[PDB]
């Protein structure tokens, strides 16, 4: 064809080695390229590219500010002309404008948080929408405006809740041994799956949960990790604060049973809560407690701990092998995102020109996507609001700081099993026999 002069239209300028680079192997994959040439292929006239659009929109603020993005796509939209110009308005002016509008579609639809944060950004968007013309254009863009006005505001019945020493309603009696182990693992899996689902890629992209404004940008992620940390700490605290060896063997056993049910529900965050508790300094050393622990449950806990070993080779294998719903362990995702960003260049230099490294951003987007796949399917399980609120309001650390508390735990480990073994009196008046992890009927 034939395009404007690259002096009233920056995108008109053509591909070159100083402009775009691709991969190997359909529609060709961008290795890297100037931001101009990225907005170009993002609204290319020869083909639509919904995949590249989703990916670009997920991962762009690490090289383009949202305001710059709007300015660039508007500059792309307003095209100069070079009567045989029918080919142009037919094979350029019209599909290019399609793609530009259809990128505003996606940006406004899935990524509306850019406009809630910057109000004048939304104002520029609404202006640009309201300057589109052509009787067909108006009817197409009408729906794009609908979206903006919108955002500006089973098989069988799930199994019966299980009860133990504590009866429904008696919240005062709730505790690790008086609730039913199955229902404990159930309701914790409900909390942990919700906490998981709620994590939004805007919090993971940019390694943004590791930086000084992490409390602002990644509140869902931090709330989930603090749940997991809290649960491991409550487990440790239940163990070492049970000074009687008989009662403490009951406690460690019930916790391994909870671990089994976590394994069944494919709640891997839940599995690693208990695994990390068992690995902690205060608990690891209680040889007298693990002595009286039956070998069935020792193989349970061994198989669970196996998963973490060799950089989780086995957890990754099992997470592959099984079928949703599940709760993955999030820290591996966090490390892979961080190391992909910090471990690959922001830019590639060709011919003394700087080219945004895009396949790094694509590698990020793949991991966020793999996260969001496990967020779709939910759990066939009845919510028990009271057990749930019990585990929400757990605070094993009290008013103590981290070190003060981990020290208290270790010092209790030495109190209860020194480096003779003393004898401590019983603390639980109710019986200590697990009803087991096989359900009722």
């Amino acid at each position: 064809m034939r395009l404007p002069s690259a002096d009233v239209y920056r995108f008109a300028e053509p591909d070159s080695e100083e402009n775009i680079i691709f991969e190997e192997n359909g529609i060709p994959i961008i290795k890297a390229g100037t931001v101009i040439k990225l907005i170009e292929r993002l609204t290319y006239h020869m083909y639509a590219d919904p995949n590249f659009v989703r990916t670009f929109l997920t991962t762009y603020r690490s090289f383009c500010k949202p305001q710059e993005l709007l300015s660039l796509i508007i500059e792309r939209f307003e095209i100069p002309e070079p009567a045989e110009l029918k080919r142009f308005r037919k094979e350029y002016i019209q599909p290019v404008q399609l793609r530009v509008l259809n990128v505003c579609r996606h940006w406004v639809e899935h990524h509306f948080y850019d406009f809630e944060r910057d109000a004048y950004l939304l104002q520029r968007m609404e202006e640009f929408i309201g300057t589109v013309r052509g009787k067909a254009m108006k009817k197409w863009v009408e729906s794009i405006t609908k979206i903006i006005q919108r955002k500006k505001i089973f098989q069988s019945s799930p199994p019966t809740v299980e009860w133990h020493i504590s009866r429904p309603g008696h919240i005062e009696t709730f505790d690790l041994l008086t609730l039913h182990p199955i229902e404990i693992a159930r309701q914790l899996t409900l909390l942990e799956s919700d906490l998981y689902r709620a994590v939004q890629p805007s919090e993971l992209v940019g390694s943004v949960w590791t930086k000084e404004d992490k409390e602002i940008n990644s509140p869902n992620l931090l709330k989930m990790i603090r749940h997991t940390t809290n649960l491991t700490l409550w487990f440790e605290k239940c163990i070492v604060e049970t000074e009687n060896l008989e009662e403490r063997v009951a406690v460690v056993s019930r916790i391994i049973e909870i671990l089994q049910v976590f394994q069944e529900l494919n709640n891997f965050n839940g599995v690693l809560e208990v695994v990390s508790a068992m690995n902690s300094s205060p608990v690891y050393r209680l040889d007298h407690t693990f002595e009286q622990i039956p070998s069935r449950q020792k193989k349970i806990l061994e198989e669970a701990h196996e998963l973490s070993e060799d950089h989780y080779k086995k957890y990754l294998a099992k997470l592959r092998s099984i079928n949703p719903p599940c709760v993955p362990f999030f820290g591996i995702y966090l490390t892979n995102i961080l190391k992909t960003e910090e471990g690959n260049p922001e830019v590639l230099k060709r011919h003394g020109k700087e080219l945004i490294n895009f396949s790094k951003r694509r590698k990020v987007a793949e991991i966020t996507g793999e996260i969001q796949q496990y967020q779709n399917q939910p759990y066939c399980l009845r919510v028990e609001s009271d057990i749930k609120r019990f585990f929400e309001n757990l605070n094993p650390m009290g008013n103590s700081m981290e070190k003060e508390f981990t020290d208290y735990l270790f010092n209790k480990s030495l109190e209860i099993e020194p480096r003779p073994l003393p004898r401590f009196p019983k603390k639980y008046s109710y019986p200590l026999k697990s009803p087991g992890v096989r359900p009722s009927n």
Partner: peptide, 9 residues
């Protein structure tokens, strides 16, 4: 020997 929960010895 291994972990407090590893296979017997």
């Amino acid at each position: 020997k291994x972990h407090p929960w590893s296979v017997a010895n």
